[model samples]
Target: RTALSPGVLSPTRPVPNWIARPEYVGKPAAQEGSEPWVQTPEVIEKMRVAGRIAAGALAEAGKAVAPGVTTDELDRIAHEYLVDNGAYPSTLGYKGFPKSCCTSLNEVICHGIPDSTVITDGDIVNIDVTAYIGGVHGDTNATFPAGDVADEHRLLVDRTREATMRAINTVKPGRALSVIGRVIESYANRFGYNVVRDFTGHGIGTTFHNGLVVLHYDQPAVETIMQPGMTFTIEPMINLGALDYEIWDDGWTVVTKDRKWTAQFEHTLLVTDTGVEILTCL
Candidate 1:
């Protein structure tokens, strides 16, 4: 397979002025800190709405993935969906990110900028979407097959998603945060895949990234306990080859060092008394 390269980016898409946007939009990304970890019931309700809008936008974009489709086109589909639904695309202008959503094609781990690159058959695309509305943020992503994907790549995508769910299942009041990473890493290891450790899931609610870290690899020292009313994301990036990755000159796109395909799945979750609620689900 040919290695990925940067493509020309189109002009930034605009969001309607009436839509609620994060305060950091159009400015340098603000430092994330001093935010509460456990959200209140009122905030959780807004998160649920934002999560559904993000998930719906993602679904619309994912369905348009096909041979000859440009990643920029996918971005447009998602961008429109979010604004039309009365939410702002969270990634747009966040820390200078140009696109409304991320379209990470094969070999790209995450934060793959939406550009003129054409997605061909047999490629796997990961569309990451986040929306801000009702004073909260919702983020989620999943890998989709372009068409007639190779069996090996398909397994990588399937298992990565399964790893996300397996880890999410461990969420509950009083469970250690380390369990999230331990479960994901162990499950990925069974398939000879390496979990990308540089990036991690994060606390999300009022801010795109709240002041909390949720690692996707085992770290016994991280004993932060999950509590009811806590909202965060669990996104695991699994690589088919080496786990090391490099950022593009654009400073946003991240591709595997070996240029081998990697898959990722993410969801913003809310911890409940009995278990957890996948806020990003439709």
Candidate 2:
């Protein structure tokens, strides 16, 4: 069987009236508004609050991972958590996404829609959760083991998390943005894994995805300096097989071409005067 399969999609849950939504929430997009890369101190604090909310929601979603649990169920848990906290689900309806959170099963690279897919024992799944609060966004994700997963699968998730932290630790004011990817690629390659080149970590704040292009593979030449108050995400998609990927007919779910298992970890970060702050962390 091919790695790709038709995903089950649920209805787009309505955003509560109290929460403020983006311009593209109701309909498809046309207008292109400029997004800010550098955030001010007040906006940065808002991002921190949003990030903490997302992190808590993610923790709940991660705890829900187990054999026989459906991805849609986890999605509901996170969706309610964010809404109860007076935040909007960033992934819902943005670019026409139907789900509240992204659940990528084995072989699926990223953007896997939450659905009726029942995760069985030994399956490694990645749950991505983001929350929009106070006109800003916070994003973070981690791969979880459903049950007794293979050692190789465990290694993939562990190393991916390590690589993400390594990339974040490398961030500084004068360093090139390429070094983030460089550090990720070097660490992932050490385990004989390939980094997905298509999808990348993105800048997150007031918008779902904006600002600088954060790549996961090594591109040592693209030097976009990180200034103070710059916020972005560094998510590394590491695959056990070929790095090539394909987007499904849903136009969101991206899967690996070689049908091998994949893992990823993400966190929204804030560039500080001295160093960086992991906004989406426990």
Candidate 3:
């Protein structure tokens, strides 16, 4: 039999009233409760310290990633760096997650459990890790090139990261989330890339993880009214092919739909009266 044509073969099915056109597909995200959140000055100070440790560990772990090295080594380094410095790995046992660091290679988008997986040449991996110290938490990640990666992979990493940095600067108090999404979506569209829709950024502070999930591939009318003392992360996961995605058998990690190129970047921040303080950088 010939392959059926794409675009919902069954025309008898009703078109969703909410969906006006193809551009609006996957545009409206599910709504969650928005609790007014504010960090105490003391907790913010602790978060200040938490940010330093988290950023340092990611940078140090970056140096440890290379050919012939198991991702477990990188996990160990991150764990030691945090625990030795009196900080805790926010991910180590959270909801049965085993590793202190998440090392997702290639198709893996997030929640990559650390194992003996050897990062080989031309493999792109996303390492997502966070630190908890002094009653505060900080989150960050970067897509790294394994040894000799393809030119396309390198560009994906570069562009995804640049978008992350761009959004970080937009976290000041009173900035509309619509503006942030416009900037992030603009970057992905310019490269003809698609942003992964399954996972998004969230707020982290006194609790290791909290509310305020922000999708990078923002559509129209996304509302996020920022205020001073609010803290959250800006992470955008861009796919080389389609934006569709699925979860792996592991039940935690999410992968791209077409199984093509995927890259991501993240940073935790506090909304200040004037500008944002990037809590997850060196």
Which pairs clash (backbone N, Cα, C closer than 3 Å) in model 3? none
Residues 1-282 of candidate 1 have per-residue lDDT tens digits of 599899999998878888877899868766576799999999999999999999999999999999999999999999999999999998998899999999999889999999999999899999999999998899999999998999999999999999999999999999998999999999999999999998999999899999899999988899799999999999999999998888999998999888999999999999998789999988
What TM-score goes with each of the models?
A: 0.99, 0.96, 0.85
Give the lDDT of residue 252 in candidate 1: 88
Better of 2 and 3 by lDDT: 2
Residue 182 error, candidate 2, Å: 0.8
Q: In candidate 2, which residue ranges exceed 4 Å CA deviation? A: 1-4, 30-33
For residues 1-282, could you state the per-residue lDDT of candidate 2 as single tens digits? 235477576777776897988666767861223577888899999998999999999999999999999999889999999999999988887778888899999999999999888888899999999998898889999999999999999999999999999999998887788999989999988989999887898877677777568998988778689888899999889999997888888898888877899999999999998789999976
Superposed by TM-score, candidate 3 places the C-alpha of residue 253 at a distance from the truth, in angstroms, of 2.1
| Residue 41 in candidate 3, Cα distance off native in Å | 1.6
Q: Rank candidates by TM-score, best first.
A: 1, 2, 3
Angstrom error of the Cα, residue 237, model 2: value is 0.3
- The number of clashing residue pairs in each candidate reads 0, 0, 0
RMSD of each: 0.8, 1.6, 12.4
Residues 1-282, model 3: lDDT tens digits: 121111111111122243222121233332223534667778788888989899988888878878776767777777777776677777765655556778777776677766766777677777777887776678889887878988888999999998888877777778786666678988888989887766777777766556777778766677767888888888888888876767655666666666786888888888887888888878
Cα error of candidate 2 at position 119, Å: 0.2
- lDDT leader: 1
- Which 10-residue span in candidate 1 carries the lowest summed lDDT? 25-34
Instruction: List where candidate 1 sits over 4 angstroms from the true fold.
Output: none
